[model samples]
Target: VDLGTENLYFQSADTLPVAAAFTETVNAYFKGADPSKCIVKITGEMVLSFPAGITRHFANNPSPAALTFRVINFSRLEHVLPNPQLLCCDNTQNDANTKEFWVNMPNLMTHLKKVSEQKPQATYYNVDMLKYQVSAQGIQSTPLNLAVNWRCEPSSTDLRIDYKYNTDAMTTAVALNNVQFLVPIDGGVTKLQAVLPPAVWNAEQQRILWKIPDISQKSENGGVGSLLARFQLSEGPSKPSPLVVQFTSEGSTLSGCDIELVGAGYRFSLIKKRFAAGKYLADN
Candidate 1:
């Protein structure tokens, strides 16, 4: 379990023996109807698991082993939300960009025991948990772009929304799931017609929701789609509210941060990383 060398133990097996999965979820809000005013909220959690034999070894002889986890080059870290349940301490060095945490194995065993009492068959435990927000100016380079246009006339108003998914930003082909655009319409509407079939009109909420099951580079028109509607309002034509967007990306993180783990007593069989979108909106 020496951490000095990168290649110490390599077991060629079909499955991993011990593993850790790191997941980060981001909730971004684009205020003021502009990308510059975007603020991103991030939450991160890591789950570490070991085999039943290793868990028994630790349960019998709880030694004083410490595991260090480091996150490299995390930019614009604003504030850290406090959580008392985690058995790790902030061992960050003097460097301004890196965040490091040291976990106590004995304390972690105690926490795992409590969790095992609840489940009785659980072998894994969550550790090295963190939550914080960052001023992500780079989020303006969103994977999806929205172009909206409104045409006012004496009889009716014509609205057009064009959405394009940018494939250049991603290395591999990825799809956005549950893509929706919520557009608020003002004034009373006498009749409405949608050129797009999936547009749902919520009369009680006074909003039109354009729901897309999935959007990818292989989608129709090469990841480009449009929504067109003709609205006949009682009052004069009014502008629509800022669009609210929602979608989940599976394999990408907006912050572009990666984690590295080094320790002396244990070896990781697998390391998993994932990112997903929580709440993304546009406010004018």
Candidate 2:
């Protein structure tokens, strides 16, 4: 008989955004005259400009520029779409903010196809949301504006996100937090801005002040590009086990019956381990 299984023990923890969080905030935004919409469909060009250009556009007006994002995939199990989310934001960052948005898989799929079609010579990279701001003048640069709190829960067919928007700078901001949701085929540099923190959630509220200091200031880029982010999954079943069994009887009708212990014990083990992450490089 074989001995026991020499197996490893311990559960895995999810911490993919160690390099993407900011100061732990104590507030949340919801229930307002202008609450966030229920869903978002992103498509088309997200235009950004030079800082002075941003300054002129905003000074003439007090509203963040409306961005037309080409819709990418939606994470729903049934329905899908391909269009742009006409996302609107404040041109200023002097208040507590909370923005809500939904994910649609079909729309995202269409978005990716269209982007690949339009910009055939760009490398898409993972977006950094906190370092910049978003507005009608396109994406503008600003000092980092951290979040207070964020929530991400999986419903029957969608991923629901709600987040707190914080600002230390007194400039307008348009955050697009949805990039993290796009994962491998992400929103790319076209959709990413260093200003207006992302509308999504970084959710690292329990570690090291819940923030990763800025390495590079979040600013807009004119180069066609992409952003790559990551995550994990699990494994599968292995080959069948082998065992043999039989019984023997001797000495009939005896007052004292003798018994003996049999062969060795059996063993059980797992077959293999697997690897997977949200990986796919997109061209701008």
TM-score of every candidate: 0.72, 0.17
After superposition on all CA atoms, what RMSD does each candidate show versus the true structure? 6.6, 33.2
Q: What is the lDDT of residue 103 in candidate 2?
A: 25
- Per-residue lDDT tens digits for candidate 2, residues 164-192, read 22232112232322122221111111221
Tens-place lDDT per residue, model 1, 1-284, is 55322212222122224576656565665544344465656665556665433444554455635667666656545435344454455545554677766665566667666666666655455544566554444344456655666777665777777776865433345788888888887766667865574687888887788888889877776788788888888876666567777777666544556567766555577766665566656554
* Cα lDDT listed for each candidate: 0.61, 0.20
lDDT of 2: 0.20
In model 2, how large is the Cα lDDT of residue 84?
A: 28
Model 1: which ten-residue window has the lowest total lDDT? 5-14
